[PDB]
Ligand binder design. Structure first.
Ligand SMILES: O=C([O-])c1ccc[nH]1
Ligand SMILES: O=C([O-])c1ccc[nH]1
Lengths: 311, 310
């Protein structure tokens, strides 16, 4: 009676280098048995309130990426997923997939090895390593423009690359900033000023793509690079910028196909990557670690005005 | 072996008018059997990492208030609670107590009625109503200053009251804004400019207290008032009912025991009364908390942010 006064959605939360992913294990309505793309179309049209319940406050946050677990079409896939966020439905998500694969191991569904995950944009290949880190083959990445110059209000001129790695990035090495975990405020201020400069100048990705991620790179004594990424807003989910960086290295002849590249973030998260050439860019494979944060049942009470999230 | 590679903390999340509260049911270390204040001291000194695990990202957020459930000292109390947030440990929390009491009902520990909750700053009285809303007796509230004149940058002059209701509020009726749910951007910009003007002018609460909550009021066809509160930042906020009551009382606009009804721009409704006390009023505020989640927080030995991202 009271029990029946609220819906239940079972979830498992993880984070990959501090970016959160929420895997919905059960509690969404049936979306039929077509491809992930077709199931996503049903979810988006018939049951979008379930996305908002899971992602929006008070149950989630604007930086949260969600993934709905689905039984895949092919029996040789470990799972099917549909990714979503506070704005809508996504295609592929790199750091999210690391979370998903780690979570599937936590649930006891898979052991170390190669696994295929169905998505609305195609089947993703991933390797679960013995240490439970995951190598994920991401979408096609490429550099749109090299050494694009602008004046950063309050700081001065800089050049950077415009690159696509599932998100539009402006990538800068010669920024004069100290890239370290104890300097995030100064870095954030710099990168925000950069994004504003791009706006003012009307600098975009291909087809007017909004460059909403800024990445600052620096030498590092232990890795090939130390980076800081500024995420959309001051809000939407954040990439780590590894794929975009690889596309620039590849285009400049600094890194061959197959060569291993190692990047660390200012908060200490480490990523190892390689790429293979493809038509119109590179296909990068990125290894990273996700950690578990919670198992939960979200509760959606009939009389809660924000039961489907606060909009 | 795998199971033992991580700590588990059982929590229940609720929200009262969109403001979230996290009740920690189990998984913190023992804090002894002293008073709530003595247990708080042990927690703050020995086990503060447990607070950060719960409140900080990735498991929590800056606006989250936490509450650790403890076995009370008095057998006349339903529970004991230690409130905390991202910056540290709190005393009493009105909207948080609404969540706690609703949550105790969800756990099957209490039925509708009057209950006492021990806190580090004293025993709070609350009524759980049949509809599962809760009336909480809050801390002493009072008005510090009446009709303070202020130049709002980019807007022009206003009068406001400075009042304490668990927090320092600047309360304004003559703001010239439309106080409605679909107009939060403009309301936010205006309230921000107000707070900035308070800073510039050196206007504070008693003992130089920082005025970090701005509340804009307006007439409402269904209620005594419609309000918009600008919260600090980011960190949690109250909804300014107690502070408003204190000004109403001081102006002879609302008698002790008379019922006042206030709606927020997002639609949350609070009913309230007060009784006179030494140095101000003791308000009792009724509101509704809804359940958000039941969860087991997981703290892996190898996760670098296992105790929160600091
Ligand atoms: O930086 C990236 O593109 C990435 C892929 C998976 C995790 N990060
Ligand atoms: O002062 C308030 O807004 C309040 C709400 C719930 C308890 N106190």
């Amino acid at each position: 009676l009271y029990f029946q006064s609220m819906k239940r959605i079972q979830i498992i939360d993880s984070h990959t280098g501090g970016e959160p992913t929420r895997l919905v294990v059960s509690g969404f309505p049936s979306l039929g048995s077509g491809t992930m793309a077709e199931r996503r179309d049903v979810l988006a049209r018939e049951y979008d309130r379930y996305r908002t319940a899971c992602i929006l406050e008070p149950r989630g946050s604007d930086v949260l990426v969600g993934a709905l677990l689905c039984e895949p079409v092919s029996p040789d896939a470990a799972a099917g997923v549909i990714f979503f966020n506070n704005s809508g439905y996504l295609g592929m998500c790199g750091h999210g997939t690391i979370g998903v694969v780690r979570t599937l191991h936590h649930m006891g569904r898979i052991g170390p090895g190669v696994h295929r995950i169905e998505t609305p944009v195609g089947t993703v290949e991933a390797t679960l390593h013995d240490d439970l880190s995951v190598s994920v083959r991401n979408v096609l990445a490429y550099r749109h423009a090299k050494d694009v110059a602008l004046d950063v209000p309050g700081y001065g001129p800089v050049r950077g690359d415009i690159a696509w790695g599932g998100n539009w990035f402006f990538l800068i090495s010669d920024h004069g900033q100290r890239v370290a975990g104890d300097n995030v405020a100064a870095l954030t201020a710099y990168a925000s000023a950069v994004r504003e400069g791009l706006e003012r100048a009307g600098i975009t990705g291909a087809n007017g793509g909004e460059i909403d991620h800024i990445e600052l790179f620096a030498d590092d004594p232990e890795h090939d690079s130390r980076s800081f990424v500024l995420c959309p807003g001051l809000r939407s989910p954040c990439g780590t910028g590894t794929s975009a960086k690889l596309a620039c290295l590849a285009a400049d002849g600094k890194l061959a196909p197959g060569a291993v590249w190692r990047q660390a973030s200012v908060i200490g998260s480490v990523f190892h990557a390689s790429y293979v050439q493809a038509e119109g860019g590179i296909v990068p494979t990125i290894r990273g670690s996700a950690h578990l944060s919670a198992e939960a049942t979200l509760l959606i009470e009939d009389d809660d005005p924000f039961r489907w999230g606060i909009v």
